[PDB]
Design an enzyme around this catalytic site. Structure first.
Site, PDB file in Angstrom:
ATOM      1  N   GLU A   1       0.803  -1.227   0.000  1.00 12.51           N
ATOM      2  CA  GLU A   1       0.000   0.000   0.000  1.00 12.51           C
ATOM      3  C   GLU A   1       0.842   1.285   0.000  1.00 12.51           C
ATOM      4  O   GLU A   1       0.452   2.267  -0.644  1.00 12.51           O
ATOM      5  CB  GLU A   1      -0.975   0.034   1.187  1.00 12.51           C
ATOM      6  CG  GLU A   1      -2.136  -0.939   1.087  1.00 12.51           C
ATOM      7  CD  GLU A   1      -3.183  -0.675   0.020  1.00 12.51           C
ATOM      8  OE1 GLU A   1      -3.077   0.341  -0.706  1.00 12.51           O
ATOM      9  OE2 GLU A   1      -4.100  -1.516  -0.108  1.00 12.51           O
TER      10      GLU A   1
ATOM     11  N   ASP B   1      -6.071   6.416  -5.219  1.00 10.44           N
ATOM     12  CA  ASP B   1      -5.545   5.103  -5.597  1.00 10.44           C
ATOM     13  C   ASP B   1      -5.719   4.857  -7.119  1.00 10.44           C
ATOM     14  O   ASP B   1      -5.847   5.816  -7.886  1.00 10.44           O
ATOM     15  CB  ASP B   1      -6.222   3.998  -4.752  1.00 10.44           C
ATOM     16  CG  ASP B   1      -7.731   3.853  -4.902  1.00 10.44           C
ATOM     17  OD1 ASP B   1      -8.365   4.761  -5.482  1.00 10.44           O
ATOM     18  OD2 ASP B   1      -8.282   2.846  -4.404  1.00 10.44           O
TER      19      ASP B   1
END
Ligand SMILES: CC(C)CCC[C@@H](C)[C@H]1CC[C@H]2[C@@H]3CC=C4C[C@@H](O)CC[C@]4(C)[C@H]3CC[C@]12C
Ligand SMILES: CCCCCCCC/C=C\CCCCCCCC(=O)OC[C@H](O)CO
Ligand SMILES: CCCCCCCC/C=C\CCCCCCCC(=O)OC[C@H](O)CO
Ligand SMILES: CCCCCCCC/C=C\CCCCCCCC(=O)OC[C@H](O)CO
Ligand SMILES: CCCCCCCC/C=C\CCCCCCCC(=O)O
Ligand SMILES: CCCCCCCC/C=C\CCCCCCCC(=O)O
Ligand SMILES: C=CCc1ccccc1OC[C@@H](O)CNC(C)C
Length: 440
Positions: free
Chosen positions: A210, A219
């Site tokens: 991440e 994202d």
């Protein structure tokens, strides 16, 4: 005409060592972020290389080009003592680094040294005092001096500085100064690489997959995220994302969170992913059938996509339960998820196939630091070991010593005093310091 070409190459080697190590020392000396225990040993190492580059390598170059020693018998014995001191101090510092990295990785602190800057300074000073004594006293007290005629003629002559030694010294100095710290460094740093890989957990795995950002970002899908892949909202509004952030932390964030606050949210999300698996009837049995490493790979999927999302892989989970890894991997590759985040998917899929952390090898910044220190160690070995092997062999075998081979292999070790600064260009902290000191 060969002398000219040889002279230029040798001058550039001297220049590459001097500015290279001066830059490294100046970087640690001025930049606050670089004043670590590990970098204090790196300074001890860079000092030996700078001393090698200013006091050894220039006089070595002169001895080759002039085919004679023009500095007398006193500077000859002193020069040799300094050279040996630089090699002995460099390898003992690299051994200390390895031992310190072991104690750190085997502590709850994991990447921070157990030593204080005061303690490290004492360790460095003790290394130099001992290395100075073991390297100057057998040369000054003439304990090194060989008894054969060719050696005695070289000692008496003020124009001869050929390193002639008795078999005893050439074994004793080699074992204490080089082989002993090398054997320990290689044996201890292989354990540090082992512990880094073995002690890899879900938290580290997710900080790799991440990443970490204390600023709000979007994202792959475009959803607002913060910290270690913590989705704020599906709404395409910064205010909507800031509100959910202020509510989650419990203070006026203004879109910025602390490292302590990022870890708080992370420990909560990981906990939620594990909790979600146990409450899900389709994921809970698969979670039990998996081992410690492969459980993290399933926690990783539930963290990214979610409980319901992962439960959708009815075929994949079934074969994970049945321990058919390679078969599960193909169905995992044949998915929307694999197309979406292929770099992250490949890693998790490899974990499910292998059952090891091999995919997350030197991916963490703290692990890359161990690799960088491992490169420094490994290069020193490749540069000095041929000289030392051929040195100890021509003590037992007596013949095939030569001057051409001996000096050449000694120079393989000499060129190493210029490599360490180039290897520090791997560390972003050093890179940031170098470009600032060079005004780029
Ligand atoms: C050729 C001989 C006589 C000179 C040897 C050079 C000596 C003086 C140098 C080489 C390595 C140096 C050390 C390198 C590392 C550090 C860390 C720094 O935070 C404080 C000083 C300290 C502890 C240095 C003190 C001086 C030192 C010991
Ligand atoms: C002769 C070489 C002189 C090099 C010796 C200089 C050592 C000082 C040093 O590198 O340390 C930086 C500073 O003191 C840490 O806070
Ligand atoms: C052998 C060389 C050993 C050099 C000692 C390194 C010091 C160290 O690693 O620290 C130990 C621990 O922090 C306890 O104080
Ligand atoms: C140049 C080669 C340097 C050798 C150092 C080394 O082998 O590196 C260890 C690490 O495990 C490699 O991934
Ligand atoms: C011969 C001497 C050659 C080089 C050594 C001198 C370099 C030291 C410069 C220090 C400048 C600085 O403060 O960074
Ligand atoms: C031999 C000395 C090694 C001592 C350091 C401990 C590291 C280890 O146990 O592998
Ligand atoms: C006697 C073997 C050589 C040796 C043993 C232990 C530590 C360092 C040693 O030597 C390193 C070389 O760089 C010496 N070079 C000479 C002075 C030209």
């Amino acid at each position: 005409v060969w002398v000219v070409g040889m002279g230029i190459v040798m001058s550039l080697i001297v220049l590459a060592i001097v500015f290279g190590n001066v830059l490294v020392i100046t970087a640690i000396a001025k930049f606050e972020r670089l004043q670590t225990v590990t970098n204090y040993f790196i300074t001890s190492l860079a000092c030996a290389d700078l001393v090698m580059g200013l006091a050894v390598v220039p006089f070595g170059a002169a001895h080759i080009l002039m085919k004679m020693w023009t500095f007398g018998n006193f500077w000859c014995e002193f020069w040799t003592s300094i050279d040996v001191l630089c090699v002995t101090a460099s390898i003992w510092t690299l051994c200390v680094i390895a031992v310190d990295r072991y104690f750190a990785i085997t502590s709850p602190f994991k990447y921070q040294s157990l030593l204080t800057k005061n303690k490290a300074r004492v360790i460095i000073l003790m290394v130099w005092i001992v290395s100075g004594l073991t390297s100057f006293l057998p040369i000054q007290m003439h304990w090194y001096r060989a008894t054969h005629q060719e050696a005695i003629n070289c000692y008496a002559e003020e124009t001869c500085c050929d390193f002639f030694t008795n078999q005893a010294y050439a074994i004793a100095s080699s074992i204490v100064s080089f082989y002993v710290p090398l054997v320990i460094m290689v044996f201890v740093y292989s354990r540090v690489f082992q512990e880094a890989k073995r002690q890899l957990n879900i938290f580290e795995m997710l900080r790799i997959d991440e990443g970490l950002r204390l600023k709000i970002y979007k994202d792959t899908e475009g959803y607002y995220t913060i910290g270690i892949g913590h989705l704020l909202t599906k709404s395409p509004s910064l205010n909507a994302a800031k509100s959910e952030l202020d509510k989650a932390i419990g203070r006026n964030t203004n879109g910025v969170i602390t490292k302590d606050e990022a870890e708080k949210l992370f420990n909560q999300d990981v906990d939620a992913a594990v909790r979600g698996i146990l409450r899900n009837a389709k994921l809970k049995p698969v979670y039990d059938s998996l081992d410690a490493v492969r459980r993290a790979a399933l926690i990783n999927m539930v963290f990214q996509m979610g409980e319901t999302g992962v439960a959708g892989f009815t075929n994949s989970l079934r074969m994970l339960q049945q321990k058919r890894w390679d078969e599960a991997a193909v169905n995992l590759a044949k998915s929307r998820w694999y197309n979406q985040t292929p770099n992250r998917a490949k890693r998790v899929i490899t974990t499910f196939r292998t059952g090891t952390w091999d995919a997350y090898k030197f991916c963490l910044k703290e692990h890359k630091a161990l690799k960088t220190l491992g490169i420094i160690m490994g290069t020193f070995t490749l540069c000095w070991l041929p000289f030392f092997i051929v040195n100890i062999v021509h003590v037992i075998q007596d013949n095939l010593i030569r001057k051409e081979v001996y000096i050449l292999l000694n120079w393989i070790g000499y060129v190493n005093s210029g490599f360490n600064p180039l290897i520090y260009c791997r560390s972003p902290d050093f890179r940031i310091a170098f470009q600032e000191l060079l005004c780029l």
